[PDB]
């Protein structure tokens, strides 16, 4: 990066908001995954959308890659600057606007986390449900297509993003559904909002997101249920979904993950394949849901429900920290997560096979995830210096991904592709799907400067 170029960047955002210092670039060259740090050539913090547009235009016309950066909690290397360039940290734009309680909508800028939003919403009777474990940027969640434990009932980011404000690679400002618009459904033109959800910073920079809010549940009950085997836990899950019980949360932990979470959060659940459940409704619709759900879990050997404000909060905090609980099994290690999502009737086969495969392998793996969506994570630990173990973990993850594709599923339910799953994506959608995705990338980013090396 030339001195003239750096000075041009400082003219847009101000000298304190541009850094070429090695330590600052290294901090923005990696996310939470094991993907190797690849530092950008500079980090820039735009202070408003006009500055985002002008930074993008400067980079784009000079042939300098752009890497959007939210909270850096991704797990597929999305922020790694594989071709160098300018990392745009968007978190100084942190305002909540256009809170429309009567329409159940709100507009947020990239520095707003879900925690910040739900704090702002206390005493409104509304909440935003999509809950990744990490305290992530909501616009980053829109960029990755995130989901979480609440998605089985309340939907993913794709279900809950109503509109996006996007700075395109050359600096133009796009409101995907129209500036200021919010509504429940539309057939007007092509749905641009869904194209940018899950685009991972390869099609443009999300500078605000319009989110669907939901009413807080009238009443909540959480519980855990221990099972004799993975098969019994996942069969119960499939049967709960087939019985159409509107469970609010249904999270699976294998015995390895349950033990890790016990040690990391000082829970002391029985070490066993376990479901964490939550039910929303009136005092009485809960009783109906509980009866029907306990009946199914009992048929599969589930324990009597161990029931759980503070107790529930510690239960789900432990679940949200499962990633760090797994890492704590081997201090100094990094982690790589699988994220397959299969048709629900095939979930028992692939989960049980994954458990058997982790057992037969020398790898440390913990299993957790959103089995209500037919989705789960195998969290695999890697010694950052053991090159052979890394090759074993990547091979394990790619074999699992190919098994999911063989079952009609997808290689990633929520984390995205980034650097890790590019070959699986090619297999998943085939030559015409890849070419079509690439033609869309090319028309929005002709010079290929919008987060190069990711997704495609
Ligand atoms: C402990 C832990 C638990 C997690 N649990 C979940 C979970 O349950 N569900 C889930 O889906 N994910 C989960 N994640 C992954 C991660 O939190 C999500 O992928 C989240 O959406 C990433 O947001 P971010 O701003 O931190 O992303 P970053 O790492 O900053 O960026 C991720 C990607 O999005 C792009 N990007 C970021 N912000 C923007 C923007 N404003 N405009 C355009 N592109 C942008 C980046 O260029 C990159 O390619 C977890 C992560 C951790 C560490
Ligand atoms: Mn998850």
Curated annotation (Swiss-Prot):
One of its GO terms (biological process) is lactate catabolic process. Its cofactor is FAD. GO terms for cellular component: mitochondrial inner membrane; mitochondrion. Its EC number is 1.1.2.4. One of its GO terms (molecular function) is FAD binding. It is found in: Mitochondrion. Pfam families: FAD-oxidase_C, FAD_binding_4. Readily detected in liver and kidney, with a weaker signal observed in heart, skeletal muscle, stomach, brain, and lung. It catalyses: (R)-lactate + 2 Fe(III)-[cytochrome c] = 2 Fe(II)-[cytochrome c] + pyruvate + 2 H(+). Residues 36-216 form the FAD-binding PCMH-type domain. InterPro entries: FAD-bd_oxidored_4_C, FAD-bd_PCMH, FAD-bd_PCMH-like_sf, FAD-bd_PCMH_sub1, FAD-bd_PCMH_sub2, FAD-linked_Oxase-like_C, Oxid_FAD_bind_N, Vanillyl_alc_oxidase_C-sub2. Coiled coil: none annotated. The modification N6-acetyllysine is found at residues 10, 266, 394, 421. Involved in D-lactate, but not L-lactate catabolic process. Interacts with CSRP3. Belongs to the FAD-binding oxidoreductase/transferase type 4 family. PANTHER family: D-LACTATE DEHYDROGENASE (PTHR11748), D-LACTATE DEHYDROGENASE, MITOCHONDRIAL-RELATED (PTHR11748:SF111). This is Probable D-lactate dehydrogenase, mitochondrial. It comes from Mus musculus (Mouse). The lineage of its organism: Eukaryota, Metazoa, Chordata, Craniata, Vertebrata. The gene is Ldhd.
